[PDB]
Design a protein around this ligand. Sequence first.
Ligand code: CLA
Ligand code: CLA
Ligand code: CLA
Ligand SMILES: CC1=C(/C=C/C(C)=C/C=C/C(C)=C/C=C/C=C(C)/C=C/C=C(C)/C=C/C2=C(C)CCCC2(C)C)C(C)(C)CCC1
Ligand SMILES: CC1=C(/C=C/C(C)=C/C=C/C(C)=C/C=C/C=C(C)/C=C/C=C(C)/C=C/C2=C(C)CCCC2(C)C)C(C)(C)CCC1
Ligand SMILES: CC1=C(/C=C/C(C)=C/C=C/C(C)=C/C=C/C=C(C)/C=C/C=C(C)/C=C/C2=C(C)CCCC2(C)C)C(C)(C)CCC1
Lengths: 158, 176, 137, 137, 33, 159
Amino acid sequence: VKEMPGVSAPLGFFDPLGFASKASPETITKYRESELRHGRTAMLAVLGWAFTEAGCHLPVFPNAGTNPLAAAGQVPFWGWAQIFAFCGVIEFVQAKIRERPGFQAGDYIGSGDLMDEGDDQWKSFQTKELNNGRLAMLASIGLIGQTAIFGQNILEQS
Amino acid sequence: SVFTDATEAFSKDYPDFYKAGWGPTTKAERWNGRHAMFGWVLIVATGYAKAHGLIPDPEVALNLKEWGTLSILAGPQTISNERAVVLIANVHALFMSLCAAFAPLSFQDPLLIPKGQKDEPAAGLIPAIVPGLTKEAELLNGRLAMLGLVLVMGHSLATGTPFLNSVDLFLGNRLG
Amino acid sequence: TGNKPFDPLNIAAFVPPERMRQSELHNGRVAMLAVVGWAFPELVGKFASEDVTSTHALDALSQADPRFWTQFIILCGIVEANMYRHYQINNNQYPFFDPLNLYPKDKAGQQSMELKELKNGRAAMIAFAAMLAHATI
Amino acid sequence: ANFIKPYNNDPFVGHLSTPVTTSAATKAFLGNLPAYRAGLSPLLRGLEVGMAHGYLLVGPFDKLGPLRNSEIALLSGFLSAVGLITILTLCLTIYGKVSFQENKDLLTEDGWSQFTSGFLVGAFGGAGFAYLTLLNL
Amino acid sequence: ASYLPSILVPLVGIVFPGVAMALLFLYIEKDDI
Amino acid sequence: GSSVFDPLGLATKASDAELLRHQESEIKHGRIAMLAILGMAVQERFHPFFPTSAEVANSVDAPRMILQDYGWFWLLALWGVSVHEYDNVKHTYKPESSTVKPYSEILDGRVPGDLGFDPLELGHKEDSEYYNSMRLKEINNGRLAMIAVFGACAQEMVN
Ligand code: CLA
Ligand code: CLA
Ligand code: CLA
Ligand SMILES: CC1=C(/C=C/C(C)=C/C=C/C(C)=C/C=C/C=C(C)/C=C/C=C(C)/C=C/C2=C(C)CCCC2(C)C)C(C)(C)CCC1
Ligand SMILES: CC1=C(/C=C/C(C)=C/C=C/C(C)=C/C=C/C=C(C)/C=C/C=C(C)/C=C/C2=C(C)CCCC2(C)C)C(C)(C)CCC1
Ligand SMILES: CC1=C(/C=C/C(C)=C/C=C/C(C)=C/C=C/C=C(C)/C=C/C=C(C)/C=C/C2=C(C)CCCC2(C)C)C(C)(C)CCC1
């Protein structure tokens, strides 16, 4: 839908390939959910990539502090298992959210039942989140790509 | 009767505890009798284990470092390993006891009288004689076991011999 | 409830029958799996170090890695939680376990199959008791 | 916008509908906890709470107790957790017998009694499971 | 003798106060008699 | 079935319960099988995704070597498949209501194989004839792929 947040941009509504042109409300809601999940995950991924690149490593990961893709190996299988468990717990919470009648895509704060009235500033700030998230998605995929192709790694003239 | 008068005096003195079943009540009698029956079983088993040395024997005393200052008796002395072993054999049953006391099986008899209910009628000097797994048999055997514990303990204390050795003296001297 | 009253002795005076039939079934199914547990290893063989090499004896209890006991308890707890979700919360009124569905539509078929399961399970109980008699009297 | 509005649309009650107090996240998270979940017998609520709080409690005693440096640290921690659980169940029983005196919602004599029995069983289960897990790790 | 303190001190310092406080708590807020 | 012909056997023709669930199972098997065969082909001619796999005689023995080396990948794949199926259960099949055994009845008015995955609207639902013909094409290519998967496990069999 054109009214939902994220639209404000130089491009305006950006749907070259028809995906929301005839999509039922369920499919558009799922598309927005995916966009927000990817965007937030990418924002965190870029921030973590910056943290690792700058040498900022936890005391428990002393040896590996140079290349994030290299650092990924240092994590034992059970560390990744616990990452997955935590993400699954949050996903279970969000699934419990979506059962509530008045759910809007990505509004895990229940803004509809919280705001005194729907506002334009709220839409603009949701758009800010979506835009920084889209940029973070592109930037994170680009970071991984540029570091895989050229092994020198960011901050090393990459 | 004298027993009835004593029970009435207890009821008047401490109505709350008597109501809940605490004190001289048939529920308490049954519980103590069951415990005493198991206790006779456990004393027989302890004697047999002492005879066959299954218990680590008093030659060995628990190390202070591993078992902490709880093992300390007085100062340097430490609880013997046999006393610890018997205590643990008892701790198993005590853990069971708490579990079954606060979370009784629905068909199980509660430890305390239910709020609505009242204690069952008194058995009397000679409880009604009926064989098999019937309440009267259980109560009679519990009374017998508790009396036996009392009088064997009296024997051991008066003569000065250990309780286990007094039990050995009885039977046919099978145990030790 | 669905076996018919030809019981050898009286124990049901002070115990509800619904829970007791459920316990009959639980213990019977576990006993069938346990009889297989004490037959199949001996007949077909144990298949790894087992943390200590032994078979045909109860001692495996101590030899088996506690990891296995933990995971087995977890599995049993989760399956029992689902089975409790049935028959006591949602009262689904259809059998909890029926992939490749059996258990005929007619009520009489239900009763007959329940009787068959009870018989096969009681026999397994007796067999497991005899096995433990073989082992440790 | 305005994310802070009076709770229940009642300006004169001592509460506010802040994002922490009244948001889909918190309502759904608290509404699925055993203490507030719908369609749970009080026994099940107690069992869930006890399982959560028993496994949770072995660790501090095990790792920071006086016997933490001995080879029997885990057993001492488990025993301390068991004792504390027993104390808490005593507390629960007395609270139930004092509060609700003149199966249902958890706020009743029988409801609270079932909750406490479930809590004891679940807490001992959690402590035992934590012991089993830590015994080999 | 030399065994009693181990038995009694825990009872007097833990079990006795625990049961005493439980009973006092029950009686203080009994709301009847 | 294919064209306007009838089934090739006894063909569960006496299924009082509607065949919708069996048709859903058929289309699911077929989609899995066609993905499997196309994958297998690409793997046999191209294998860059998981290096250090040593020698792979054919696609059949690749899973064993991956388990040996990349054990976590199969856990991740199983997670993905399971979560996807659970998510599908929402818009396919009828929920439990003290009856309606779970995963037993396709919801009324829902053509089998419809998970809503129509991003490019290549198959026009409005045009009934075109949509039905495309469904038939999918089903038949999928049956062919299902046969082909075993015809390929023959590659494992010969050696
Ligand atoms: C008021 C007098 C008094 C005081 C202050 C103490 C103090 C003590 N006694 Mg001793 N004791 C006393 C009288 C007293 N005793 C008498 C008369 C006897 C003969 C039965 C004993 C026999 C005795 C033994 C056999 C042992 C102690 C031990 C102890 C110590 C631990 C407490 C304990 O376990 O009690 C246990 C005491 C009893 C079971 C009997 C009760 C003691 C008196 C009679 C109670 C007086 C109550 C008082 C009037 C106030 C009541 C109000 C109160 C409820 C608030 C402690 C230093 C233990 C020890 O040495 O540890 C190192 C130990 O093993 N006591
Ligand atoms: C005055 C009586 C008294 C006695 C006899 C004890 C005895 C003990 N305390 Mg101390 N304590 C007391 C009062 C007392 N406490 C008071 C008033 C405080 C508050 C200031 C404390 C604060 C305190 C701390 C902070 C700690 C102790 C600890 C300990 C234990 C020492 C460690 C050890 O070797 O055991 C090893 C312990 C075990 C093997 C666990 C067994 C635990 C119990 C005995 C199991 C049975 C409990 C039973 C079911 C409860 C009945 C409930 C109800 C009926 C009363 C020991 C059992 C330490 C401890 O427990 O370590 C974790 C510890 O860290 N105590
Ligand atoms: C039933 C289907 C199926 C199964 C079980 C497998 C299983 C396997 N494949 Mg094959 N594959 C498949 C379909 C399948 N594939 C299809 C349809 C393609 C597209 C041509 C590929 C392309 C492919 C390549 C190029 C390679 C593998 C490899 C492998 C192995 C390692 C996993 C991997 O990297 O795969 C990669 C799988 C994909 C990228 C799947 C894309 C298509 C799926 C079916 C759609 C949905 C997946 C999900 C949303 C993620 C999409 C990721 C995105 C990049 C497209 C593993 C044995 C690797 C190997 O070691 O071979 C020996 C390897 O190098 N596969
Ligand atoms: C549960 C159980 C069981 C069982 C148990 C029981 C049942 C027991 C019983 C027990 C008992 C039951 C005991 C008893 C005892 C008794 C005694 C020991 C007695 C004594 C007596 C006397 C001492 C006497 C005296 C006298 C005379 C001489 C004459 C008369 C008078 C007078 C009194 C003086 C079993 C085995 C299965 C095992 C497990 C546990
Ligand atoms: C994530 C995180 C968080 C939180 C966390 C938490 C809070 C956790 C918890 C945890 C827990 C809390 C856990 C628990 C667990 C438990 C368990 C696991 C249990 C188990 C149990 C069992 C197993 C039982 C058993 C039994 C019984 C019941 C009885 C007896 C018998 C038996 C043994 C069978 C936050 C966000 C804040 C932050 C970050 C991190
Ligand atoms: C109905 C019917 C019929 C027919 C039947 C048939 C013939 C069936 C078949 C069926 C089939 C025959 C199916 C198949 C399926 C398949 C599938 C479902 C597949 C899967 C696959 C996968 C899962 C994959 C795997 C893999 C991996 C893992 C890695 C790489 C390699 C590969 C790719 C292999 C008739 C006409 C007689 C009539 C009567 C009834």
